[PDB]
Amino acid sequence: EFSGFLVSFMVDARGGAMRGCRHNGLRIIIPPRKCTAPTRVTCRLVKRHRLATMPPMVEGEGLASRLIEVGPSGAQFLGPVIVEIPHFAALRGKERELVVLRSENGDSWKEHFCDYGMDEVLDSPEDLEKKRICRIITRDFPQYFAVVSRIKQDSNLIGPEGGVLSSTVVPQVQAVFPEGALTKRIRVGLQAQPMHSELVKKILGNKATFSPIVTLEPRRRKFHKPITMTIPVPKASGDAPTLRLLCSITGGTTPAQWEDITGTTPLTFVNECVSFTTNVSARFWLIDCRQIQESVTFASQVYREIICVPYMAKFVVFAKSHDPIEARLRCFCMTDDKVDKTLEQQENFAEVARSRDVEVLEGKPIYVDCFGNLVPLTQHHIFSFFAFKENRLPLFVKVRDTTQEPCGRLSFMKEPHQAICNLNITLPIYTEERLAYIADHLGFSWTELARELDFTEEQIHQIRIENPNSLQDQSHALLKYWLERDGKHATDTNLVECLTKINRMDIVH
C-alpha cells in the first residue's frame, strides 16, 4: 500500500529538517517560526501502482514520481515550507516541465500554487535539474501531491478583449485571439513539442520532416471568432508543394487522430513561419514529405513514438549459476526510486551489472541480446518498460567456451543501431508426490508461481491449452514441467521462496 515512513519527525517554532531514509534526495524542511505547537511531519510514497483516483492525465503526460503523502494532511504553516522529491522524468532541457498537483481528500485533483535562518543548503536550479529533485514549496499539506511530467505549457487568462499566447520553448509558435473570440475570461494553454531529427529519421528515414507539435488547450472548444496560429515550417522546408498542415481535434484522454486539412486551410508564409486560422482549439502539426498522400500515415507512426513519456531508468542484472554450463539471468529495467523491494528480493542471485540512469520510453519494448562467451538458450528476448513498476526479463544462458572465463555482454535496444545501454557481465560459479499435494492447493496461484519460476507467458498459455478448465490439472502440469526443466536444482527452498512471494504462506505449511 505504502512505502515505509521515509520521513517522520517532530517540529515546532524552532523549525527542523530531515532527509528520507531510502532515496537520500527526499527531504523536508520546516523553517523556524512556521508553527507554534509541536507537529509530527511525515512523508511516504504511495507504492500501489494506483489508488482509487489517479490524477487525470492526457497523451504525453505521466507521473514523474509516485504519489507523495506528506502528513499530517491538512496541516498549515505560518509561511512556506519545503518538500523535496526525487523524480524520474527526463525533461529534455526546457521541452518538458514538472507540474505539481494536489488532492485534499484523496478524491479530486487540482494544480498546486504557492507564492513566495537555517543551517540547511538548498541546491541551485541547475543542481536540482541535475539531480532530478522536484522542490515543492507550500504553506500547507494536502492528502496527496502528484508530480506530473508534461510538455512545457505557456498559459494566460484571455477574455473578450483578446490577447496573444506565445510559446517560451519555440518563440515563433503563437496563437492570437482577436477581440470577440471569447465571451468570457478563460485560461488558455499553449504547448509546442519540438522534433528531434535523430528519432524521426530512425522512424521514417528521410521520408518526412516535421514542425513542432502545437497544442492549444483546453482542446476541442469552439471560438466565436477565428484564432490565428503561427508555426515554424519543418526542417529545410518552406513554401513548397510537399508541405501539409495536419490537425487532430480529439479531446480529453482519447488518442490523437491526425487529418490533412491543407486543402481547406489557407496558409500565409512570413519569416519562415506559416500562419493560418482555426475556429476550434486542437493539435496542429506541419509535415513536409515527398509522398503527400502518405502524410497521415507518416505522422501517425512518428506520433505514436514521440508522445510516450521519457523516463530515466537503470538496467540491473542478477545472475545465478544453475550448474557448470548453465546460468540464469534476471534483467530489470526500473525507475530507481527505492520503493520496490526488487533489488533485495533476489535471494540466491548475485547482482552482476548495473547501468547509469538512461532514458527509456514509457510502455515501449526493449530487446535484449547476449554476446561474447555467453549464449542465450533460444525468436527474440523482449520485455517492456513501465515507470514505477517491476519490469523483468528472465534469460537462460550457457557458457560458449568453457576454456574461458564465464563472461559476456548484454545489449539493451529499442529495436531488433546504437543501443540504450551495454553491460559487461561475469557470472557467479557453480559448486514428487509432495509436489502433487502442493499443486492441489495452488488454485489461481499457479500462474503467479510460474512467473516467479521464470516461465514465459507463452508457456503459461501452453499449460492452459493442455489442461483445459482445471486449476488443479494446470497446477500439476506446471510443477511437472518445473521438475523437468530444472532437474536437481528444484528443491523446496526455491518453491518456499516463490510461494512466500505470491502470498501463499498457507501452503508453506
The CATH number of the domain where 468 resides is what?
1.10.533.10
What is the chain's length?
509
Nearest to 472 by CA among 432, 507, 500, 445: 445
What CATH number did the domain enclosing 65 receive?
2.60.220.30
Q: Please give the Cα distance from 267 to 347 (Å, whole number).
A: 64
In Å, what resolution does this model reach?
2.2
List the CATH number of the domain containing 312: 2.60.40.2660
Q: Which three cell numbers stand for residue 148?
A: 506530473
Cβ-proximal residues to 396 (8 Å cutoff; 6+ apart), any chain: 322, 326, 327, 328, 329, 376, 377, 454
Element (H, E) at 212: none
Cβ neighbours around 303 below 10 Å, total: 24
Shared domain check, 411 and 295:
no
Q: How many CB atoms lie within 10 A of CB 163?
A: 18
* 410 and 441 together in one domain: no
Experimental technique of record: X-ray
- Residue 143, C-alpha cell as written in the block: 492528502
Do 443 and 416 share a domain, yes or no?
A: no
Q: Are strands 62-63 and 16-19 parallel, antiparallel or unpaired?
A: unpaired
Q: Is 60 helix (H, G, I), strand (E, B) or coil?
A: coil
User: Each residue of 179-215: b (16+ CB within 10 Å) or e?
Assistant: eebbeeebebbbbbbbbeeeebeebbeebbbbbbbbb
Q: What is the DSSP string of 291-310?
A: -GGGHHHHHHHHHHHHTSPE
Task: Decide if 147 contacts 70 (C-beta within 8 A).
Answer: no
Q: 139 and 1 share a domain?
A: yes
SS3 38: coil
Same domain, 285 and 345: no
Judge whether 152 and 96 are in contact, CB under 8 Å. yes
What kind and span of H or E run contains 501? Answer: helix 492-501
| Residue (of 78, 69, 142) closest to 112 by Cα position | 142
Cis preceding-peptide flag for 218 (omega within 30 of 0) = yes
Boundary-marking domain end, from 91, 125, 151: 151
- Which helix (H) or strand (E) is 359 found in, with range? strand 358-361
Q: Which residue reads 482445471 in cell numbers?
A: 470
- In the numeric block, the cell 521541452 is attached to 95
Q: Do 329 and 212 share a structural domain?
A: no
Return the amino acid letter for 83: V
CA distance 144 to 67: 7
β strands within 12-53, DSSP E:
16-19, 27-30, 39-45
Sign of CA dihedral 406, 455, 411, 424: negative
Place of cell 534483467: 331
CA distance 19 to 38: 19
Write 296-301 long-range contacts (CB < 8 A, 24+): 296/246, 296/258, 296/259, 296/260, 298/204, 298/207, 298/208, 299/208, 299/210, 299/246, 299/258, 300/258, 301/203, 301/204
Cα dihedral 309, 314, 317, 318, rounded to 10, equals -100
* Shared domain check, 169 and 297: yes
Q: Are 449 and 400 in contact (CB under 8 A)?
A: no
163/140 same-domain check:
no
Nearest to 94 by CA among 8, 169, 197: 169
Instruction: Name the domain boundary from 404, 432, 460.
Output: 432
Q: Which of 456, 453, 399 is CA-nearest to residue 430?
A: 399
Give residue for cell 478583449: 161
Q: How are the residues of the chain apportioned to helix, strand and coil, as percentages rounded to the nearest 5?
A: 20, 40, 40
Residues preceding discontinuities in the chain at C–N > 2.5 Å?
A: 116, 378, 416, 431
Strand residues in 200-325 grouped as ranges (E): 208-210, 213-217, 222-232, 243-248, 259-260, 268-270, 273-280, 283-289, 310-320
In the numeric block, which cell numbers belong to residue 93?
532541457
Count of CB atoms situated within 10 Å of the CB of 491: 9
Q: Do residues 18 and 48 share a domain?
A: yes
Query: Grid coordinates representing 369?
Result: 541480446
Interatomic CA distance for residues 361 and 309, integer angstroms: 6
Three cell numbers written together for 359: 532514458
Contact present, 151 and 98 (Cβ < 8 Å): no
Q: Indicate if 362 and 229 belong to the same structural domain.
A: no
- The continuous run of DSSP H or E covering 364 comes out as none
User: Within 10 Å of residue 63's Cβ, how many Cβ atoms?
Assistant: 24
Note whether 502 and 445 are within 8 A (CB).
yes
How far apart are alpha carbons 34 and 502 in whole angstroms? 46
d(CA 130, CA 310): 16
Which long-range CB contacts under 8 A does 458-464 form with residues at least 24 apart?
none
- Is residue 253 within 8 Å of 58, Cβ to Cβ? yes
- CA–CA distance, 297 with 299 (Å, rounded to integer): 6
Sorted by sequence, the CB contacts under 8 Å of residue 58 that are 6+ apart come out as 252, 253
Cβ contact 388:148 at 8 Å: no
Its domain, for residue 233, covers 153-306
- Overall domain count for the chain: 4
Going by C-alpha positions, the residue among 119, 182, 116, 187 that lies closest to residue 157 is 187
Same-domain check for residues 286 and 356 = no
How far CA 193 is from CA of 77, 162, 204, 272, 296, in Å, comes to: 38, 25, 18, 18, 18
The Cα-based distances of 428 to 177, 178, 322, 424, 488 in angstroms read: 66, 70, 10, 14, 18
End residue of a domain, out of 151, 171, 196? 151
How many Cβ atoms are within 10 Å of 67's Cβ, its own excluded?
Answer: 24
Residues 56, 114, single domain; the answer is yes
Residue 375, C-alpha cell as written in the block: 549464449
Cis before 428? omega within 30:
no
